[PDB]
RNA sequence: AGCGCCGUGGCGCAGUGGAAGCGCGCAGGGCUCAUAACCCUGAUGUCCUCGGAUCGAAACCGAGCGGCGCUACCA
């Protein structure tokens with residue numbers, strides 16, 4: 001089946017960080033975004049079953065300017081960029097996740 | 100004829116990963132509500 | 148004749164303004180650490196002080212609320228379990244509501260005492276005797 | 282106040298008269314391509330305090346402590 005430190009990425013112009021609250025089905029998920037929203041995130045292609053995610057993982061999420069209650073993932077962090085951005089406080093301190 | 104109730108992006112089927120720009124539109128003639136695709140790449144921002 | 152009632156009421160109000168100019172506002176913000184499998188609470192000593200509460204009784208009450216196990220490390224509580232800071236904050240809120248400050252009147256200077264084997268509470272500002280143990 | 286119970290290894294039971302126990306937990310390993318299941322190895326103790334017969338007690342007993350249930354408010 002298998003034979004068949006990268007630079008962290010920052011939010012910008014309609015894009016931010018989110019905290020997965022519950023894992024939905026069919027490739028959906030819900031993310032509490034650090035804007036005051038409990039948005040729903042869809043998993044994009046080239047990433048759907050390319051990177052595996054889990055509840056409790058900081059997520060880089062692109063938004064939909066034409067649809068404010070829906071959003072889609074662009075990138076997932078391996079718990080190191082999360083602690084980093086927490087130290088620089090990019091995401092509000094009211095959301096603390098560690099492991 | 101109809102009126103755009105709002106604008107949405109609906110996700111494609113299984114073998115194709117992409118989001119297609121569509122519009123939730125209310126029909127004038129009978130009152131029923133439906134959804135409509137918008138072709139021609141740069142035209143959701145034309146909808147208003 | 149209720150005239151000699153208002154004067155001693157005035158005397159009491161002057162007593163109150165003399166003794167207690169400030170008339171809790173001294174709860175340390177419970178900044179916790181949820182390290183996945185682990186949880187570390189450093190503020191446990193500070194909340195022990197600012198509430199005038201001995202550490203062992205507070206930590207055993209925390210363990211009695213939630214059936215989770217760990218140790219005490221260092222001036223901190225290291226519990227290996229899963230809890231958001233909101234829920235442990237809530238548990239501390241309950242303990243604050245019903246132990247550090249009495250429901251009937253605003254006070255906090257009361258502390259643990261042992262009046263014929265349980266923990267019987269008494270106050271200092273007042274002189275209360277209430278049987279709060281469980 | 283007296284009597285019935287007890288004194289953890291993180292737990293519950295225990296043999297309590299040779300001196301550290303069993304399962305549940307936790308760390309680690311094994312099997313498997315891999316996971317779970319299964320299989321092996323473990324470090325944890327003043328087995329609560331003080332004295333006593335005893336080669337020797339954690340165990341057998343008693344001059345104190347703590348926590349449990351009743352007698353029940355025992356001027």
Ligand SMILES: [Mg+2]
Pocket residue numbers: 003
């Ligand atoms: Mg190759």
Ligand SMILES: [Mg+2]
Pocket residue numbers: 042043044045072110116117118
């Ligand atoms: Mg997508």
